[PDB]
Structures are given as C-alpha cells and as structure tokens.
Amino acid sequence: ARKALIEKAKRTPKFKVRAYTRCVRCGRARSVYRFFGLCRICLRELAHKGQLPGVRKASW
Amino acid sequence: GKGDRRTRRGKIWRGTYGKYRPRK
Amino acid sequence: ARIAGVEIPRNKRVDVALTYIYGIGKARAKEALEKTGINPATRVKDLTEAEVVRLREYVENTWKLEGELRAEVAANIKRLMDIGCYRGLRHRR
Amino acid sequence: KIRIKLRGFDHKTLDASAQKIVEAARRSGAQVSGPIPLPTRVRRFTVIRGPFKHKDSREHFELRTHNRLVDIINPNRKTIEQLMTLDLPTGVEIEIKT
Amino acid sequence: ARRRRAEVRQLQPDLVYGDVLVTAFINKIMRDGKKNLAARIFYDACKIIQEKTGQEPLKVFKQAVENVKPRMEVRSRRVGGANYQVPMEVSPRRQQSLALRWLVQAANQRPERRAAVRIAHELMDAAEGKGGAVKKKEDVERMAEANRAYAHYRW
Amino acid sequence: EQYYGTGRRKEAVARVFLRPGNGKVTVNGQDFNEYFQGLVRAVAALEPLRAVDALGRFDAYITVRGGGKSGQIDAIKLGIARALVQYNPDYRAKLKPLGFLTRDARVVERKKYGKHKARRAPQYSKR
Amino acid sequence: PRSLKKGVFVDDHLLEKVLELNAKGEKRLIKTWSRRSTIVPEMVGHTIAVYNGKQHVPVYITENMVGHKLGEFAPTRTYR
Amino acid sequence: GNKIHPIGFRLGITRDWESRWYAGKKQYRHLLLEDQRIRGLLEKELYSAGLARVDIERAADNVAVTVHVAKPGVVIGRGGERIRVLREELAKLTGKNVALNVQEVQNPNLSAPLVAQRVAEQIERRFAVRRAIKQAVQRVMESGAKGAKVIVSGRIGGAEQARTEWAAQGRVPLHTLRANIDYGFALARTTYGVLGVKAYIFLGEV
RNA sequence: CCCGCCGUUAGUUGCCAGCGGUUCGGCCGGGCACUCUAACGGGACUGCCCGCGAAAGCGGGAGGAAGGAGGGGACGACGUCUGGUCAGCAUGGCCCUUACGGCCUGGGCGACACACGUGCUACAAUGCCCACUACAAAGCGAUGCCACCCGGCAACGGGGAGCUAAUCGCAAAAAGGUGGGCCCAGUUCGGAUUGGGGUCUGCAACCCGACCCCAUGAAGCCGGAAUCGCUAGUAAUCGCGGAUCAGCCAUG
Ligand SMILES: [Mg+2]
Ligand SMILES: [Mg+2]
Ligand SMILES: [Mg+2]
Ligand SMILES: [Mg+2]
Ligand SMILES: [Mg+2]
Ligand SMILES: [Mg+2]
Ligand SMILES: [Mg+2]
Ligand SMILES: [Mg+2]
Ligand SMILES: [Zn+2]
Known part of the structure; x- marks a missing residue:
C-alpha cells in the first residue's frame, strides 16, 4: 500500500484497462469489494463496529 | 465426456454454446 | 471399399467409417454422405459400387487427406521451425 | 391509484413506516391496497476472518433490502394531506409512482 | 459409535411387490443414487425370470438370497502372539447385508453385456445352488468350519 | 362437492382437491401417468387413498411445482392424505398410524466453510 | 491458432519509423520494444532488434515470417 | 485469536x-x-x-x-x-x-469507549497499568452496572516481554446474545510501542 | 438466525379452485380462498400414560407437523504454542534518503527431463451420441442483464423491445423421461497434443487469454507401498448462482 502506489485515484490511466480498485482505508488492493470499497479486512472490522448499515452478520 | 468441448455436455460443463449446443 | 488414399473402412455405418480416414472425422463424414446422398446408417458392406465411387470421387476430391495432409502438417511443422520462431523452438523444446 | 413502494434495510422501521402511510390514508381515500410484502434481496458477503492464510475460516455477512408497496387506490384530496408531512422512520426510501 | 448401538433404519416396502428385501436389493444395484434406473434393472430382471423360468419372479429372488446368506464368519482377534481368525455366527441383520451385496457384485463380475440379464440370471443361478454369487458364501463358511485355537480361554 | 389438501416435501408444494368422481386424477394438466412418466415412485403418490380405499370413489385434481418430480410425488402424498381427512376425520385413525399424514422435514443441509459439501471436508497427507 | 479479427496491429512507433526508411531504401539496425506488433511486408529485409527485457536481439525479418510478431524470434527464457 | x-x-x-x-x-x-x-x-x-x-x-x-x-x-x-x-x-x-x-x-463511567480511553491515557502518562485497570474496573463496578472487565495489551511498563493484564467483576457474559454488553477499544501509543486497551461493560438485560 | 405444522396481517404472486367472455399463453372481468411472499405470533415441556430408579434420568406407548437438545447455523472458557501476519492496517528500535524513494517500456511472477499436495476429466454400456419433451432453489443486472429478427456450421456481429426489476432479462437447469443409434473394439469410450481457420475482450493477447470450427485424436482398460471423507437427506451423483472481474487461464 505504498502511498505512491496509491495513485489509482489518478484518473489519467492512459488506458482504462490499467485502472484498479485498491482499498480505501488499507490501500490493500488485493481483494476489494465494489459495493463498499473495502479491503476484505477493512470491511469485516467496520461491519463489526457497526459502521456499515444493514451489514448484519449473516447467518443461516 | 464432459471435457470434450465438442458435444452437448462438453459445452454445458463449459457454459458455452456452439454448433453442438444451439440456443433454441 | 478402398476410398481415400488406399483407405478401406468396413463393416460399420458409413458415416462412422469414413472417419478411419486421416482427414475425415464425424464432421466431414456427415458432410460426405450429406452431399453424396447415401443413407448414413447404411453399412459399407451393403453399399452400391456406384454409391461408393461418388464418395470415392467426392471425399478424395474435396479434402486433402492421408499422406498429403501429413505431408502438409510436418512441412508446416518445419516451416516455423525453419525460422527463429519460438513456437518453433517448441518442436525442439 | 397511487403506487407507494417502500424499500429499506430494516423491517421494524419499515412495516411501521408503511402502516403509517396506511392508517393515515384510511381517513380520506380508498381503503388502500393494504401493506403488501414482496421478496427480499439478500446481499451475502463472505470474508476470510483473519488477514493472511487461514482460508478455512471466513465470516458471514448479509445486507438485506426490504420491500413494501402499500398502494392507495382512488386518491381524494384529503388523502395527500397527512401523507405530505407525517413520517418518522429514518433509513427508509420511498418512491411514489402514480 | 461408542454406545447407543445405532438403530437399523427401516426402508419403505416395494411398489410392485411391497416386500422390504426387494427395495433393499434395488438399493444395492443403484449407483450415485438413481433408483429408477436401478429400479428398472430389477423389475426388468424380474420380468426376464417369468420367461426363462416359469417360477414367479419373487420366489426366485427371495429363494436365491437364503442360499447366499452366510451363517458363520471369521472376525479376527488378537489372542496375543498373532492375528487369529476366530469365527462367529452371523447376526440375521448382517446375513442379508452381505447376501444382497454379494449378488450385485458377482453379477457385475459376469460376462453378459447388460444390467437385468446380469441380475436375473445370477439370481436364477442362485435358486439352484449355483453361481459366482453362491460361490463366495462357500469360500466363506469354510474358513469357519473349524476356527483355530482359543484354549488359553479354558472357561 | 370439493375438499382441499396441501402437502410439501423437499421444497415441493402440492395442492389436492379430491372430488366424488371415479378414479382419474390430473396434475397441472396432463394425467398422473403423463407427468410421472417413467418414474416408479409415482405409484406411491396415491398410496394414501389405497389406505382408505379410494380412486374408486374420489377424483384428484392436483397442481404442483418446486422441488423435482420425486420431491413432488411425496408432496402429493401429503395433500391427498390431508384432503381425505376432511371428508371423514374418522380416517386419520388408520391414515397416520402409517405416517401418511406427516411432513418429511428432511431438507438439503447447507454447504459450509472449509468444507466441500456441507460435511465433506477436503483431504490431507505427508508427515 | 492465431486471431486479431479485422485491422491487424503494428505500433506506429516503428511502423512510421520503418516506412520512413523505405523512402531512402533501407537502414542499419532498428531497436524497438514494440514486440507487441505484428510483422508487415514493408518490414521485410530490414533488421529490427527486439528487446528481451534485457538485451536488444537483432532480428532479421524475412518474407517467410510476416504473419508473426517480432518478439516471436526474440527469445526470453534461457534454460537448463 | x-x-x-x-x-x-x-x-x-x-x-x-x-x-x-x-x-x-x-x-x-x-x-x-x-x-x-x-x-x-x-x-x-x-x-x-x-x-x-x-x-x-x-x-x-x-x-x-x-x-x-x-x-x-x-x-x-x-x-x-x-x-x-x-x-x-x-x-x-x-x-x-x-x-x-x-x-x-x-456518567461516562459507564461508556466502554470512555472507560477505556480513561485507562489508555493513564498508561501513556506512565501510570502503573495494573492499577489504572483495577481502578477503572471498580469505578464502573461502583457506578451501577452489573459487570465490568478491562484488558490491556503487552509491553505493560515497557517490559521487554509482551504481557497481558486482567481484572473484572460482576457478570460479563459475551456468549449471551442478549446480555447487551458495551465494548470499546483504546489504543495506546508509547515510547516503547503500542498497547491496546479493551473494556467491556455489562448493563442489565434487554 | 434458517429449515419443519399452524394462525393473524397484507394481497398488481398466486387460481375455472367457484362464475361469463378468450387470439385457452390465467390473456381480460373478478376474487383473495390456495401457492408463494415477509412480518408478528402460537406450538413439545419427557407436560401426558405405562414401567425401571432414592432422585436425576433412562426404555416404550399415545395425541401431534415435529419428541426428548426436531435438522443446521451463529456462538469457540482461563490458557497453550516465544503458533501467523511488521506485505492489510498500526506501532517501538535499526537501516536507506543522485538513493533499499519514484515514473516508464519490455520482461518476470506462466519454462522442465524431474517430486509432492489439492483438484477436474476419464478409462465406458447401472454407458456414450442424436431428436423430442418435464419438474428447482438461491443470486445477478444503467456506465448492466439483453428477449425477438436476419446473418454466419458456430464463437458472434448488425438491428433492436422490456427492466432502475416477485408481476422484464440472464435461463435451457442437468441427471431424468420418450424414440432411436452404437455393440465391446482403444473402439460414435477418452479427450490430451498439434496443425489450420476464425470470433471477442482489451492500447496490446509472442513470451501468457477465453472461445468457435475442422483436422490430429495422445496417456488412459479403474490404479504399488501407503492413504482420505462421510453415520441422511448425509456419502455418491447432477446441474444452476455469486463474489473478484475488460477479459480470463474458476476443473478453485
Ligand atoms: Mg504505508
Ligand atoms: Mg466420445
Ligand atoms: Mg508442435
Ligand atoms: Mg458465510
Ligand atoms: Mg506378533
Ligand atoms: Mg452457546
Ligand atoms: Mg515464530
Ligand atoms: Mg505464482
Ligand atoms: Zn481496507
């Protein structure tokens, strides 16, 4: 998550196919979810703290 | 022969359609 | 029933047989009988010399088969192998 | 025939949400189409628990979208009255389609 | 299964004969859980027996099994020193188990290129004291008509 | 005149309506021997009637959907059974002793984490 | 099995470079990383030095190798 | 974990x-x-x-x-x-x-997040951790509530070894999906590293 | 919390179930009964009867949708291992700061003659191919899902309706069932490899994409020592969905 590498927000990609999601908290661009924009970690946490509306702990 | 890309199954298992698996 | 390049398919529903030919496989087998107009199901031992010939005449004169195909393939296999073609360093590696 | 479709992430603050639109209409317009349900779209999220390795853990997480429809038939002036400004739920989205 | 001794689940009787053993056998022919297919096979094989044989299909079945059912085994034990054979009586719950299992096996072992044929016949072969099916019940109850040294157990 | 009867096995939901007819039974349109074509378990679908002796006094008009044929076969078993009860509650006394009047709550267990098929866990090896 | 569809590609990095050389006939050595580009007739004869991610290997292009794409004669992995 | x-x-x-x-x-x-x-x-x-x-x-x-x-x-x-x-x-x-x-x-003396930061601070002020803890706990414990429990990370005191401090009174049932237990986490930056502070507070029932 | 019976609420889901019209596709009138929908609520407690016991509890029976924790989740004590992660994030100390900082193109993370792990597809007729025809759940969709027509063997292109979506689309579910073919053979089993053509995505598909079509059609005839999962609607088997995602190596 090198600050520099956090330049996805640099619209100008030269070729859209070069854009990539990146976490919006960890930077951890590995496995992010579009809906929230959260590095799978920076999501299970907020979802626990309760800062993610309706994001209830699933269960069936 | 699920794997045979050229038959009914082969397609299905591959989720594609072609000469051996028309649409309708 | 010598058909393509000295190929003698026999005893099974034609469409299946012509397949034993280097150059014929299900697809062209059908297409063969298709055009030639011969009940696919009919056995080879139960054909009409004429029928057989049309086939003989069509199959052979419609698709490069047997020794000629191989000829082409291997040749093609040298082809790129002749040039510093990587895909050609695969017929080595 | 006022189609009042409600959607939200919570029911205890929806069924009420709608009921209001309901009884508040039972004093002017038609008896309304009552509060109808409608299937709920469940957004399931599966996320491995700790970071790094441990694939076999993962923790569940759902985000459900609740729906309703209400449906006020044959409106009558005094109808659009209370309905104008008399709600109290928060996380509820309302979209009307006459 | 430490304690509680699992309880033998009881299947639902047959539809063409309504008699446990039938399904049970049906079940053994089944593969990947396909009843119907396996079903036709038995019923098919039941038909082929009214012809090639006059005897009703059921009696051929039931009377082919009892000729299979083993009445003795050899549950190995460690009398210490080596691995003894130790033979015992077959609880009637088990006999059936092996019985039908056996048939279905030996059946598929045969040559014929079918399902029923393989089944019907070996049944029939079984209703006369013959068949690869019955062969095994023999090679079995034999390793047990004597046992092998439990004298340290005096009693 | 007409009597209801609903059943539901393995996600299959069925509606039965026995009528003072003669045998004949229809499902969703075609005849029971036209929906349950080859399936042999379709015979059991009408076993509840045979319990009290029907299909010679009552006519069933059924409609099913949701859970695969054999699933529905069983569902119908419940409806019919249930319907029958509504003609003469005096039926149960000899319907239920054979379990005809019971919903098989057996259901597809779910498939969970670190496991192939609900319970089937992956394998291991080496020291 | 090879497919580009309709409108074969060649980076105008060396194309407009290679043609600017056919005006005066030919040239001596052409270094270009554009190994993503296909080979076209107007290229034949010349000598383009593809990159190997490290060194520029002069690749004498010929007629019996135009459908290809430069890099194909530009090895990458030295081995065993 | x-x-x-x-x-x-x-x-x-x-x-x-x-x-x-x-x-x-x-x-x-x-x-x-x-x-x-x-x-x-x-x-x-x-x-x-x-x-x-x-x-x-x-x-x-x-x-x-x-x-x-x-x-x-x-x-x-x-x-x-x-x-x-x-x-x-x-x-x-x-x-x-x-x-x-x-x-x-x-009475912030009943807000987990606070009962923690309270502790947190003390720690950064170089205060015996074992105390701030036992201290906080009693406070909650002593200001109503039916149960409290404070946990502090390691390096308690700049120890070279990563330890853990406890203390906790009354009932604190984390498994009872009804209890209604307030939770809170205080981080503790420090000259020797980072210390985490967890505080639970148990209030009534529903 | 979800699945099992039931009721209340609510019917632009659902039905000749009851009625008349039909382009008989529930299409329109109409009605909420049933199905389903999603909320609340009732319901099993060894409470009931017999019998063993001091008691707990245990065996059986009855009514019942359900029985002795009805199935499954969610839920993982004080602590263990100096267990994992300073590459998610955070932070102590050390170290680099014409560089262990940063940009770029190309390459590499994808090679092999090797070994192992976890898998898929098989070695076939309780099968495989073709035609016809039947039943599912759970999700997804505006910078998207794409019906319908024509074109092309096809991938797919070009035109183009509906949908911000229980009441439009992805969709045919497959195994199955019905007729028929193949007839035991490396064989209409198996699909690898390779040749050739071609479509699409993407600035670009050589190193390294998927897919369609023809041709080739390999190892493979069910596996040595050893070893794994599963006690039910499970194992086995058969498809369908999603997340990431331009596309895609998902047989995960
Ligand atoms: Mg950073
Ligand atoms: Mg094949
Ligand atoms: Mg080659
Ligand atoms: Mg989950
Ligand atoms: Mg010994
Ligand atoms: Mg618990
Ligand atoms: Mg260590
Ligand atoms: Mg790698
Ligand atoms: Zn994040």
Whole structure:
C-alpha cells in the first residue's frame, strides 16, 4: 500500500484497462469489494463496529 | 465426456454454446 | 471399399467409417454422405459400387487427406521451425 | 391509484413506516391496497476472518433490502394531506409512482 | 459409535411387490443414487425370470438370497502372539447385508453385456445352488468350519 | 362437492382437491401417468387413498411445482392424505398410524466453510 | 491458432519509423520494444532488434515470417 | 485469536448501527465513505471531550450527526462558537449540508469507549497499568452496572516481554446474545510501542 | 438466525379452485380462498400414560407437523504454542534518503527431463451420441442483464423491445423421461497434443487469454507401498448462482 502506489485515484490511466480498485482505508488492493470499497479486512472490522448499515452478520 | 468441448455436455460443463449446443 | 488414399473402412455405418480416414472425422463424414446422398446408417458392406465411387470421387476430391495432409502438417511443422520462431523452438523444446 | 413502494434495510422501521402511510390514508381515500410484502434481496458477503492464510475460516455477512408497496387506490384530496408531512422512520426510501 | 448401538433404519416396502428385501436389493444395484434406473434393472430382471423360468419372479429372488446368506464368519482377534481368525455366527441383520451385496457384485463380475440379464440370471443361478454369487458364501463358511485355537480361554 | 389438501416435501408444494368422481386424477394438466412418466415412485403418490380405499370413489385434481418430480410425488402424498381427512376425520385413525399424514422435514443441509459439501471436508497427507 | 479479427496491429512507433526508411531504401539496425506488433511486408529485409527485457536481439525479418510478431524470434527464457 | 466482537455479534438485538440510513447500488460506497470522513474529523478533534459514539443518519442531502460526549461543553464551546467551526468545517468536507447534535454522557463511567480511553491515557502518562485497570474496573463496578472487565495489551511498563493484564467483576457474559454488553477499544501509543486497551461493560438485560 | 405444522396481517404472486367472455399463453372481468411472499405470533415441556430408579434420568406407548437438545447455523472458557501476519492496517528500535524513494517500456511472477499436495476429466454400456419433451432453489443486472429478427456450421456481429426489476432479462437447469443409434473394439469410450481457420475482450493477447470450427485424436482398460471423507437427506451423483472481474487461464 505504498502511498505512491496509491495513485489509482489518478484518473489519467492512459488506458482504462490499467485502472484498479485498491482499498480505501488499507490501500490493500488485493481483494476489494465494489459495493463498499473495502479491503476484505477493512470491511469485516467496520461491519463489526457497526459502521456499515444493514451489514448484519449473516447467518443461516 | 464432459471435457470434450465438442458435444452437448462438453459445452454445458463449459457454459458455452456452439454448433453442438444451439440456443433454441 | 478402398476410398481415400488406399483407405478401406468396413463393416460399420458409413458415416462412422469414413472417419478411419486421416482427414475425415464425424464432421466431414456427415458432410460426405450429406452431399453424396447415401443413407448414413447404411453399412459399407451393403453399399452400391456406384454409391461408393461418388464418395470415392467426392471425399478424395474435396479434402486433402492421408499422406498429403501429413505431408502438409510436418512441412508446416518445419516451416516455423525453419525460422527463429519460438513456437518453433517448441518442436525442439 | 397511487403506487407507494417502500424499500429499506430494516423491517421494524419499515412495516411501521408503511402502516403509517396506511392508517393515515384510511381517513380520506380508498381503503388502500393494504401493506403488501414482496421478496427480499439478500446481499451475502463472505470474508476470510483473519488477514493472511487461514482460508478455512471466513465470516458471514448479509445486507438485506426490504420491500413494501402499500398502494392507495382512488386518491381524494384529503388523502395527500397527512401523507405530505407525517413520517418518522429514518433509513427508509420511498418512491411514489402514480 | 461408542454406545447407543445405532438403530437399523427401516426402508419403505416395494411398489410392485411391497416386500422390504426387494427395495433393499434395488438399493444395492443403484449407483450415485438413481433408483429408477436401478429400479428398472430389477423389475426388468424380474420380468426376464417369468420367461426363462416359469417360477414367479419373487420366489426366485427371495429363494436365491437364503442360499447366499452366510451363517458363520471369521472376525479376527488378537489372542496375543498373532492375528487369529476366530469365527462367529452371523447376526440375521448382517446375513442379508452381505447376501444382497454379494449378488450385485458377482453379477457385475459376469460376462453378459447388460444390467437385468446380469441380475436375473445370477439370481436364477442362485435358486439352484449355483453361481459366482453362491460361490463366495462357500469360500466363506469354510474358513469357519473349524476356527483355530482359543484354549488359553479354558472357561 | 370439493375438499382441499396441501402437502410439501423437499421444497415441493402440492395442492389436492379430491372430488366424488371415479378414479382419474390430473396434475397441472396432463394425467398422473403423463407427468410421472417413467418414474416408479409415482405409484406411491396415491398410496394414501389405497389406505382408505379410494380412486374408486374420489377424483384428484392436483397442481404442483418446486422441488423435482420425486420431491413432488411425496408432496402429493401429503395433500391427498390431508384432503381425505376432511371428508371423514374418522380416517386419520388408520391414515397416520402409517405416517401418511406427516411432513418429511428432511431438507438439503447447507454447504459450509472449509468444507466441500456441507460435511465433506477436503483431504490431507505427508508427515 | 492465431486471431486479431479485422485491422491487424503494428505500433506506429516503428511502423512510421520503418516506412520512413523505405523512402531512402533501407537502414542499419532498428531497436524497438514494440514486440507487441505484428510483422508487415514493408518490414521485410530490414533488421529490427527486439528487446528481451534485457538485451536488444537483432532480428532479421524475412518474407517467410510476416504473419508473426517480432518478439516471436526474440527469445526470453534461457534454460537448463 | 478468538472471541468475536461483542458488539457486532449483538447488532441484531441489544445494540444498533452507528450509521443508520438507506441507499445502495451506486451511492452506498460513496455515501458510506463519507461517514469515515466525518468520524475522522470528529475523532481528531472532540477527543479532550469524550467522543463516545457517532450516530450518522441520512435522508438525502440532510445528514444528522449526533456526537456523544461526556463533556458536551467542549464540543459546544464558549457560548457555542466552536459548534460553529466544526459544524462549518464539516461542510468544507461534505456539501450535503447537515446539522450536528451533542448528547451528554450519563456518567461516562459507564461508556466502554470512555472507560477505556480513561485507562489508555493513564498508561501513556506512565501510570502503573495494573492499577489504572483495577481502578477503572471498580469505578464502573461502583457506578451501577452489573459487570465490568478491562484488558490491556503487552509491553505493560515497557517490559521487554509482551504481557497481558486482567481484572473484572460482576457478570460479563459475551456468549449471551442478549446480555447487551458495551465494548470499546483504546489504543495506546508509547515510547516503547503500542498497547491496546479493551473494556467491556455489562448493563442489565434487554 | 434458517429449515419443519399452524394462525393473524397484507394481497398488481398466486387460481375455472367457484362464475361469463378468450387470439385457452390465467390473456381480460373478478376474487383473495390456495401457492408463494415477509412480518408478528402460537406450538413439545419427557407436560401426558405405562414401567425401571432414592432422585436425576433412562426404555416404550399415545395425541401431534415435529419428541426428548426436531435438522443446521451463529456462538469457540482461563490458557497453550516465544503458533501467523511488521506485505492489510498500526506501532517501538535499526537501516536507506543522485538513493533499499519514484515514473516508464519490455520482461518476470506462466519454462522442465524431474517430486509432492489439492483438484477436474476419464478409462465406458447401472454407458456414450442424436431428436423430442418435464419438474428447482438461491443470486445477478444503467456506465448492466439483453428477449425477438436476419446473418454466419458456430464463437458472434448488425438491428433492436422490456427492466432502475416477485408481476422484464440472464435461463435451457442437468441427471431424468420418450424414440432411436452404437455393440465391446482403444473402439460414435477418452479427450490430451498439434496443425489450420476464425470470433471477442482489451492500447496490446509472442513470451501468457477465453472461445468457435475442422483436422490430429495422445496417456488412459479403474490404479504399488501407503492413504482420505462421510453415520441422511448425509456419502455418491447432477446441474444452476455469486463474489473478484475488460477479459480470463474458476476443473478453485
Ligand atoms: Mg504505508
Ligand atoms: Mg466420445
Ligand atoms: Mg508442435
Ligand atoms: Mg458465510
Ligand atoms: Mg506378533
Ligand atoms: Mg452457546
Ligand atoms: Mg515464530
Ligand atoms: Mg505464482
Ligand atoms: Zn481496507
């Protein structure tokens, strides 16, 4: 998550196919979810703290 | 022969359609 | 029933047989009988010399088969192998 | 025939949400189409628990979208009255389609 | 299964004969859980027996099994020193188990290129004291008509 | 005149309506021997009637959907059974002793984490 | 099995470079990383030095190798 | 590694969402994100006050923001000029145009987040950890509540070894999905490393 | 919390179930009964009867949708291992700061003659191919799902309706069932490899994409020592969905 590498927000990609999601908290661009924009970690946490509306702990 | 890309199954298992698996 | 390049398919529903030919496989087998107009199901031992010939005449004169195909393939296999073609360093590696 | 479709992430603050639109209409317009349900779209999220390795853990997480429809038939002036400004739920989205 | 001794689940009787053993056998022919297919096979094989044989299909079945059912085994034990054979009586719950299992096996072992044929016949072969099916019940109850040294157990 | 009867096995939901007819039974349109074509378990679908002796006094008009044929076969078993009860509650006394009047709550267990098929866990090896 | 569809590609990095050389006939050595580009007739004869991610290997292009794409004669992995 | 978050494990019942509102599809993320921003500002500012929780409700370009503090006067300010700058500073961040409420804390001695930060601070002030702890605990314990429990990370005292401190009274049932247990985590930066502070508080039942 | 019976609420889901019209596709009138929908609520407690016991509890029976924790989740104590992660994030100390900082193109993370792990597809007729025809759940979709027509063997292109979506689309579910073919053979089993053509995505598909079509059609005839999962609607078997995602190596 090198600050520099956090330049996805640099619209100008030269070729859209070069854009990539990146976490919006960890930077951890590995496995992010579009809906929230959260590095799978920076999501299970907020979802626990309760800062993610309706994001209830699933269960069936 | 699920794997045979050229038959009914082969397609299905591959989720594609072609000469051996028309649409309708 | 010598058909393509000295190929003698026999005893099974034609469409299946012509397949034993280097150059014929299900697809062209059908297409063969298709055009030639011969009940696919009919056995080879139960054909009409004429029928057989049309086939003989069509199959052979419609698709490069047997020794000629191989000829082409291997040749093609040298082809790129002749040039510093990587895909050609695969017929080595 | 006022189609009042409600959607939200919570029911205890929806069924009420709608009921209001309901009884508040039972004093002017038609008896309304009552509060109808409608299937709920469940957004399931599966996320491995700790970071790094441990694939076999993962923790569940759902985000459900609740729906309703209400449906006020044959409106009558005094109808659009209370309905104008008399709600109290928060996380509820309302979209009307006459 | 430490304690509680699992309880033998009881299947639902047959539809063409309504008699446990039938399904049970049906079940053994089944593969990947396909009843119907396996079903036709038995019923098919039941038909082929009214012809090639006059005897009703059921009696051929039931009377082919009892000729299979083993009445003795050899549950190995460690009398210490080596691995003894130790033979015992077959609880009637088990006999059936092996019985039908056996048939279905030996059946598929045969040559014929079918399902029923393989089944019907070996049944029939079984209703006369013959068949690869019955062969095994023999090679079995034999390793047990004597046992092998439990004298340290005096009693 | 007409009597209801609903059943539901393995996600299959069925509606039965026995009528003072003669045998004949229809499902969703075609005849029971036209929906349950080859399936042999379709015979059991009408076993509840045979319990009290029907299909010679009552006519069933059924409609099913949701859970695969054999699933529905069983569902119908419940409806019919249930319907029958509504003609003469005096039926149960000899319907239920054979379990005809019971919903098989057996259901597809779910498939969970670190496991192939609900319970089937992956394998291991080496020291 | 090879497919580009309709409108074969060649980076105008060396194309407009290679043609600017056919005006005066030919040239001596052409270094270009554009190994993503296909080979076209107007290229034949010349000598383009593809990159190997490290060194520029002069690749004498010929007629019996135009459908290809430069890099194909530009090895990458030295081995065993 | 174990013991799920008592809060999130209770989000369904005895405990709610810090950000309650609807939307989704093509706004959620943007909107949601917006929340982390506020909470970002409110936290770096209203610290000396006792930020306890940050509810954020929405109804289209009309947010709520209801900061929970112990010393609301600090949030407010002299006559209320600072609730003018924050309230305004919040806009230069979100043009959504929202208000800002401030609910005092009924005895912060019962707000996990606070019972922790309390401890946290002490630690950074180089105070025997074992004490601040036993101290905090008794406080909660002594100010009503049916159960409390404080946990402190390692390096307690700059020890070269990563330890753990306990202390806890009354009942504290993390497994009872009804208990209604308040949780809170205080971080502790320090000259020798980082120390985490966990505080649970158990209140009544429903 | 979800699945099992039931009721209340609510019917632009659902039905000749009851009625008349039909382009008989529930299409329209109409009605909420049933199905379903999603909320609340009732309901099993060894409470009931017999019998063993001091008691708990245990065996059986009855009514019942359900029985002795009805199935499954969610839920993982004080602590263990100096267990994992300073590459998610955070932070103590050390170290680099014409560089262990940063940009770029190309390459590499994808090679092999090797070994192992976890898998898929098989070695066949309780099968495989073709035609016809039947039943599912759970999700997904505006910078998207794409019906319908024509074109092309096809991938797919070009035109183009409906949908911000229980009441439009992805969709045919497959195994199955019905007729028929193949007839035991490396064989209409198996699909690898390779040749050739071609479509699409993407600035670009050589190193390294998927897919369609023809041709080739390999190892493989069920596996040595050893070893794994599963006690039910499970194992086995058969498809369908999603997340990430331009596309895609998902047989995960
Ligand atoms: Mg960083
Ligand atoms: Mg084949
Ligand atoms: Mg080659
Ligand atoms: Mg989950
Ligand atoms: Mg020994
Ligand atoms: Mg528990
Ligand atoms: Mg270590
Ligand atoms: Mg790798
Ligand atoms: Zn993150």
